């Protein structure tokens, strides 16, 4: 773009989980049926620490969804990691959400912005059934204009497949799909693709390598929460991704709250203060170097992750967490600013 430059290596995950009355006959995933202790309920009472801006949305409501690319357009964010559980599963307490893909698709195109895909740890997800879903992925939306491809060193342009928690899986399975050998491999195929594991721990590293698979990330919005989401870590693993050709892709986040639905979870509770921490996350991300830089999230209401717009709100019940004394728009705002101080860096690296 040119006054709105869009980052194709700026990827934000984004959450279509959520349902209201209007549009899916229900509250869906705005409150949880975990405290009876109701008139604790939607559209006023949802879960959340923040409250939308949109109120207690539909992910299925296409003017949701036009909002939410406008939004995204106006950070500069290229990129939605799409949260996705296949069609075929019991997980989903709700309608199928691969059921809106091709919509979320149509919308994004739309505003010139890619999908690409966040593999949810569906129930007995394997190699197995990771094949299958693989092939249902590219065949069903590959050939979409929005559909996300990322350029290779070669110049060889790939899907993208971030697994998140990818360690439950065992390394010797991992490989029968993502290494050349494997009795599944997508490699050379017109399934391959650039798999992204998620990285917990040190010792996942080697794992990592040994499956097969083409990078990290390390999603979780709190620093400190893991080694992985630990920006002191970060130099180490990019050196590691670097010596060893992955892609490194860390994960920032405007803050973390949850306490809501964990109310021991103080300690990797997170406040905002205005930006800056969100700020100091980008920075860190910035100083390694990376390829593509992943945000967490747009739309995580109930980890309080959320850079998506949200307003002041009181009610008999709660008072919401919200971005004064700044506007509804700030973490997008600050999103623009830092992803042009990227694009500028980035054109500069090997
Ligand atoms: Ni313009």
């Given at each position: 773009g040119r006054h709105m430059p869009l980052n194709n290596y700026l990827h934000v995950f984004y959450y279509?989980?959520?349902?209201?009355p209007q549009f899916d006959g229900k509250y869906i995933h705005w409150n949880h049926p975990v405290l009876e202790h109701g008139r604790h309920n939607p559209p006023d009472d949802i879960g959340s620490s923040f409250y939308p801006e949109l109120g207690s949305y539909s992910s299925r409501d296409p003017s949701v969804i036009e909002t939410h690319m406008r939004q995204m357009r106006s950070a500069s964010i290229g990129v939605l990691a799409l949260s996705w559980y296949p069609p075929d599963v019991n997980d989903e307490n709700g309608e199928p959400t691969d059921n809106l893909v091709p919509t979320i698709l149509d919308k994004a195109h739309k505003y010139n912005l890619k999908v690409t895909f966040h593999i949810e740890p569906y129930s007995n997800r394997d190699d197995q059934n990771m094949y299958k879903n693989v092939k249902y992925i590219i065949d069903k939306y590959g050939n979409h204009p929005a559909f996300y491809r990322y350029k290779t060193k070669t110049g060889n342009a790939l899907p993208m497949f971030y697994v998140?928690?990818?360690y439950i899986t065992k390394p010797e399975k991992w490989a029968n799909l993502l290494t050349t050998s494997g009795s599944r491999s997508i490699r050379n195929?017109?399934?391959?693709?650039?798999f992204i594991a998620l990285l917990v721990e040190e010792k996942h590293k080697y794992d990592i390598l040994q499956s097969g698979?083409?990078?990290?990330?390390t999603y979780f919005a709190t620093n400190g929460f893991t080694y992985g989401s630990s920006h002191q870590n970060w130099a180490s693993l990019k050196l590691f991704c670097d010596k060893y050709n992955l892609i490194f892709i860390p994960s920032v986040g405007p803050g973390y709250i949850d306490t809501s639905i964990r109310p021991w979870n103080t300690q990797n509770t997170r406040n905002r203060i205005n930006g800056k921490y969100y700020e100091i996350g980008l920075s860190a991300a910035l100083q390694t170097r990376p390829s593509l830089i992943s945000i967490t999230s747009f739309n995580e209401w109930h980890e309080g992750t959320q850079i998506e717009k949200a307003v002041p709100k009181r009610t008999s019940?709660?008072?919401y967490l919200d971005y004064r004394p700044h506007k509804p728009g700030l973490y997008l705002e600050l999103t623009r600013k830092w992803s042009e101080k990227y694009s500028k860096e980035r054109?500069?690296?090997?």
């Open positions: 279509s989980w959520y349902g209201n998140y928690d990818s195929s017109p399934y391959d693709g650039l698979f083409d990078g990290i990330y019940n709660t008072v054109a500069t690296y090997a």
